[PDB]
Every structure is written in C-alpha cells, then in structure tokens.
C-alpha cells in the first residue's frame, strides 16, 4: 500500500528527478535538431570574413604608403641586370 | 578620429589631417565588422 500511496503523489516522480539530475549538472540533448546545421551558419565561412578584412586592411595600408611615395617624389640598367643575375645563381 | 575634426576646424591648410581623419572612421567600421563576425562565430561556441 505504501508503494503504491508515494507513486500516486508523485513521490516516486520527486525522488527520481532529484537524485538523477541534482547529482548530474552535465548537459542533456545538447545537440537538439539534426537541421541545426541546415542553415550554413557564419562559423562555417568565417574565414572567408577574416580574408576579406584582412584583404581590406592589407589594401589600405599599401595605398597610404603609396601616396607618401607619390609625396616624396626603376633604379638602374646595370644593376637590375644584378638583380637577375643573384637570383639566377640563387 | 573624432579629435582630428577639431584639428581640422583649427589649422587650415595642413590638408592632411582631414586624410588622416577620413581613413579613421573607415578603419573604425572595419574593426567594427571585424567585431560583429568574431561576436557571431563564438556565440555558437
């Protein structure tokens, strides 16, 4: 009688969701849906991001070194034959 | 960028200041988006 009087009043129910999950604190269907992934979320492609911003920051800072060389202002003939012939040897 | 505009209201014809801040503000959004992917990417982590 004693059994079937704790079951009843949800006891059996308070005593399962205390001890298996008070005493547990890992992560239970973390994962959820399989179409989490269907949308091709910016983790994927971030990197592309990263290039792009990178491409960007590259670009501006040979076009501002480029306009202090237009405001400062092909070297030689023999020696852009020296440049060839070192890296020939190289 | 914001102090180089006062530089530009005072000191005319430095005509480099209002190049030096016009590149500021652009540099500030590309640090800006540079902050909202780095922001998107590690809040799925």
Same mark, same amino acid.
Do not use: P
């Given at each position: 009688?004693?059994?079937? %009087? *704790?079951?009843?009043?949800? &006891?059996?129910?308070?005593?399962?969701?205390? /001890? /298996? @999950?008070?005493?547990?604190? #890992?992560?239970?269907?973390?994962?959820?849906?399989?179409? %989490? !992934?269907?949308?091709?979320?910016?983790?994927?492609?971030?990197?592309?991001? @990263?290039?792009? &911003?990178?491409?960007?920051?590259?670009?501006? *800072?040979?076009?501002?070194?480029?306009? #202090? @060389?237009?405001?400062?202002?092909?070297?030689?003939?023999? &020696?852009?034959? *020296?440049? !060839?012939? &070192?890296?020939?040897?190289? | 960028?914001?102090?180089?505009?006062? =530089?530009?209201? +005072?000191?005319?014809?430095?005509?480099?200041?209002?190049?030096? =801040?016009?590149? +500021? +503000? $652009?540099?500030?959004?590309?640090?800006?988006?540079?902050?909202?992917? $780095?922001?998107?990417? =590690?809040? =799925?982590?």
């Amino acid at each position: 009688l004693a059994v079937l %009087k *704790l079951s009843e009043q949800g &006891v059996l129910d308070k005593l399962k969701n205390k /001890w /298996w @999950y008070d005493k547990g604190e #890992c992560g239970a269907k973390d994962s959820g849906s399989k179409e %989490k !992934t269907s949308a091709l979320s910016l983790s994927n492609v971030a990197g592309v991001f @990263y290039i792009l &911003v990178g491409g960007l920051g590259l670009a501006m *800072l040979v076009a501002l070194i480029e306009f #202090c @060389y237009k405001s400062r202002a092909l070297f030689d003939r023999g &020696v852009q034959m *020296l440049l !060839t012939t &070192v890296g020939a040897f190289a | 960028g914001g102090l180089c505009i006062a =530089a530009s209201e +005072f000191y005319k014809t430095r005509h480099n200041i209002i190049l030096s =801040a016009g590149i +500021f +503000f $652009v540099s500030a959004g590309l640090s800006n988006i540079i902050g909202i992917i $780095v922001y998107i990417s =590690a809040n =799925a982590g």
